[PDB]
Design a protein around this motif. Sequence first.
Motif, mmCIF file in Angstrom:
data_model
loop_
_atom_site.group_PDB
_atom_site.id
_atom_site.type_symbol
_atom_site.label_atom_id
_atom_site.label_comp_id
_atom_site.label_asym_id
_atom_site.label_seq_id
_atom_site.Cartn_x
_atom_site.Cartn_y
_atom_site.Cartn_z
ATOM 1 N N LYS B 70 0.829 -1.206 0.000
ATOM 2 C CA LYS B 70 0.000 0.000 0.000
ATOM 3 C C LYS B 70 0.863 1.256 0.000
ATOM 4 O O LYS B 70 1.757 1.403 0.816
ATOM 5 N N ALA B 71 0.489 2.198 -0.831
ATOM 6 C CA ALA B 71 1.094 3.520 -0.908
ATOM 7 C C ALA B 71 -0.010 4.551 -1.039
ATOM 8 O O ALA B 71 -1.081 4.229 -1.524
ATOM 9 N N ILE B 72 0.268 5.784 -0.615
ATOM 10 C CA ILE B 72 -0.670 6.906 -0.825
ATOM 11 C C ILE B 72 0.218 8.091 -1.158
ATOM 12 O O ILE B 72 0.973 8.540 -0.303
ATOM 13 N N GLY B 73 0.143 8.604 -2.371
ATOM 14 C CA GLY B 73 1.052 9.668 -2.738
ATOM 15 C C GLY B 73 0.742 10.233 -4.104
ATOM 16 O O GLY B 73 -0.330 10.053 -4.662
ATOM 17 N N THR B 74 1.711 10.967 -4.617
ATOM 18 C CA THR B 74 1.512 11.739 -5.840
ATOM 19 C C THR B 74 1.600 10.850 -7.075
ATOM 20 O O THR B 74 2.596 10.091 -7.209
ATOM 21 N N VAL B 75 0.643 10.991 -7.960
ATOM 22 C CA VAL B 75 0.596 10.285 -9.248
ATOM 23 C C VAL B 75 0.483 11.306 -10.350
ATOM 24 O O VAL B 75 -0.416 12.148 -10.265
ATOM 25 N N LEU B 76 1.377 11.244 -11.305
ATOM 26 C CA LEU B 76 1.291 12.090 -12.508
ATOM 27 C C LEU B 76 0.593 11.302 -13.608
ATOM 28 O O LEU B 76 0.859 10.093 -13.745
ATOM 29 N N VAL B 77 -0.268 11.940 -14.352
ATOM 30 C CA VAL B 77 -1.011 11.317 -15.444
ATOM 31 C C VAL B 77 -0.639 12.036 -16.737
ATOM 32 O O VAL B 77 -0.779 13.264 -16.826
ATOM 33 N N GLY B 78 -0.285 11.282 -17.769
ATOM 34 C CA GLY B 78 -0.001 11.914 -19.048
ATOM 35 C C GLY B 78 0.513 10.873 -20.034
ATOM 36 O O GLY B 78 0.424 9.682 -19.766
ATOM 37 N N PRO B 79 1.007 11.354 -21.178
ATOM 38 C CA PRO B 79 1.353 10.493 -22.315
ATOM 39 C C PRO B 79 2.691 9.792 -22.206
ATOM 40 O O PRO B 79 3.526 9.902 -23.015
ATOM 41 N N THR B 80 2.760 8.987 -21.176
ATOM 42 C CA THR B 80 3.909 8.111 -20.981
ATOM 43 C C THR B 80 3.646 6.848 -21.797
ATOM 44 O O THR B 80 2.527 6.299 -21.852
ATOM 45 N N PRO B 81 4.703 6.304 -22.388
ATOM 46 C CA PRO B 81 4.516 5.017 -23.068
ATOM 47 C C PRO B 81 4.152 3.783 -22.230
ATOM 48 O O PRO B 81 3.524 2.857 -22.686
ATOM 49 N N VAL B 82 4.722 3.756 -21.002
ATOM 50 C CA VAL B 82 4.561 2.692 -19.939
ATOM 51 C C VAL B 82 4.245 3.340 -18.596
ATOM 52 O O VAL B 82 4.692 4.484 -18.331
ATOM 53 N N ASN B 83 3.512 2.633 -17.746
ATOM 54 C CA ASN B 83 3.254 3.098 -16.376
ATOM 55 C C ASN B 83 4.560 2.960 -15.589
ATOM 56 O O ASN B 83 5.186 1.884 -15.650
ATOM 57 N N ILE B 84 4.973 4.030 -14.907
ATOM 58 C CA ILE B 84 6.278 4.068 -14.200
ATOM 59 C C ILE B 84 6.048 4.332 -12.716
ATOM 60 O O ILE B 84 5.405 5.329 -12.378
ATOM 61 N N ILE B 85 6.586 3.488 -11.856
ATOM 62 C CA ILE B 85 6.604 3.709 -10.396
ATOM 63 C C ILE B 85 7.962 4.287 -10.072
ATOM 64 O O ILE B 85 8.983 3.586 -10.209
ATOM 65 N N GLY B 86 7.986 5.546 -9.696
ATOM 66 C CA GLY B 86 9.225 6.222 -9.384
ATOM 67 C C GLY B 86 9.535 6.287 -7.913
ATOM 68 O O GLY B 86 8.827 5.702 -7.067
ATOM 69 N N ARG B 87 10.595 7.005 -7.572
ATOM 70 C CA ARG B 87 11.125 6.964 -6.240
ATOM 71 C C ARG B 87 10.169 7.469 -5.184
ATOM 72 O O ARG B 87 10.241 7.002 -4.038
ATOM 73 N N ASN B 88 9.279 8.389 -5.518
ATOM 74 C CA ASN B 88 8.324 8.887 -4.507
ATOM 75 C C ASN B 88 7.483 7.735 -3.927
ATOM 76 O O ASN B 88 7.181 7.803 -2.732
ATOM 77 N N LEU B 89 7.166 6.715 -4.700
ATOM 78 C CA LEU B 89 6.405 5.556 -4.223
ATOM 79 C C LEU B 89 7.293 4.388 -3.891
ATOM 80 O O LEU B 89 6.948 3.614 -2.998
ATOM 81 N N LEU B 90 8.450 4.245 -4.567
ATOM 82 C CA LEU B 90 9.366 3.158 -4.190
ATOM 83 C C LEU B 90 9.801 3.333 -2.733
ATOM 84 O O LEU B 90 9.974 2.321 -2.008
ATOM 85 N N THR B 91 10.018 4.563 -2.254
ATOM 86 C CA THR B 91 10.394 4.770 -0.851
ATOM 87 C C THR B 91 9.260 4.355 0.084
ATOM 88 O O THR B 91 9.499 3.837 1.158
ATOM 89 N N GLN B 92 8.018 4.558 -0.324
ATOM 90 C CA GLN B 92 6.862 4.174 0.510
ATOM 91 C C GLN B 92 6.752 2.678 0.677
ATOM 92 O O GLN B 92 6.306 2.250 1.758
ATOM 93 N N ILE B 93 7.179 1.901 -0.304
ATOM 94 C CA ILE B 93 7.082 0.428 -0.204
ATOM 95 C C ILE B 93 8.400 -0.149 0.328
ATOM 96 O O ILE B 93 8.462 -1.389 0.427
ATOM 97 N N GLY B 94 9.374 0.679 0.677
ATOM 98 C CA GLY B 94 10.603 0.196 1.301
ATOM 99 C C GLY B 94 11.624 -0.335 0.322
ATOM 100 O O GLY B 94 12.437 -1.138 0.753
#
Lengths: 99, 99
Positions: B70-94
């Motif tokens: 579980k994470a709760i945080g900032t999500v950017l939405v836009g024309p990315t080719p693939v869904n990307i989990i970046g460091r803002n959420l990787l830190t939340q999951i340890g």
Amino acid sequence: PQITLWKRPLVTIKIGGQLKEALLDTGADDTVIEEMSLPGRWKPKMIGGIGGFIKVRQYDQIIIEIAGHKAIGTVLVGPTPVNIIGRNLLTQIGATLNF
Amino acid sequence: PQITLWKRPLVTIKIGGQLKEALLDTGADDTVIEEMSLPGRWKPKMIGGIGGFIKVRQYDQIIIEIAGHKAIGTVLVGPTPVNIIGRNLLTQIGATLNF
Ligand SMILES: COc1ccc(S(=O)(=O)N(CC(C)C)C[C@@H](O)[C@H](Cc2ccccc2)NC(=O)O[C@H]2C[C@@H](C)O[C@H]2[C@@H]2CCCO2)cc1
Ligand SMILES: [Cl-]
Ligand SMILES: [Cl-]
Ligand SMILES: [Cl-]
Ligand SMILES: [Cl-]
Ligand code: NA
Ligand code: NA
């Protein structure tokens, strides 16, 4: 080492006799370095991601030292906004994501 | 888990009751998802990728499950080719990088 992700995971590399800073990037298939000379043959390639594509030169069988660990593989050279160590070389140093 | 990098580090995420595939990306400062409906207000953000800058929609405080974590945080939405989990959420999951 264990590298936390509170900040960008930057390390020192040695490539072509030069020290550089580069990002350890699990989202990158490929390793991409800012403009520099490398020895041997190359061929053109297009790589894409957020913002579209750039043209790079592909050099095969290039040795890099990544945070003290030697690896060999393909290195792309071109107008990348940051030096990126991608999965093709992260595998060779035994890098894993853990959670 | 311990995730090796011989293949892309793709996981299942859940956002707005929907399952999606996403890439665990240590080279990404933030999390970027393909066009979808999210609740609440959004703010503007420019992000820079390999090919240049794009405009995205920034949604704060969004509930997201990443590989069962579980994470709760900032999500950017836009024309990315693939869904990307970046460091803002990787830190939340340890998540850490290890070699
Ligand atoms: C601020 O938050 C951000 C800002 C930028 C990005 S990002 O542009 O996606 N980017 C930043 C990086 C280029 C420094 C993260 C990268 O890992 C990015 C993630 C991604 C984007 C689009 C499709 C697939 C995978 N990888 C990426 O661009 O990879 C390409 C460039 C080269 C290194 O290798 C290429 C190949 C093909 C695509 C995957 O690997 C993500 C979040
Ligand atoms: Cl940082
Ligand atoms: Cl390679
Ligand atoms: Cl392995
Ligand atoms: Cl950015
Ligand atoms: Na070569
Ligand atoms: Na919000």
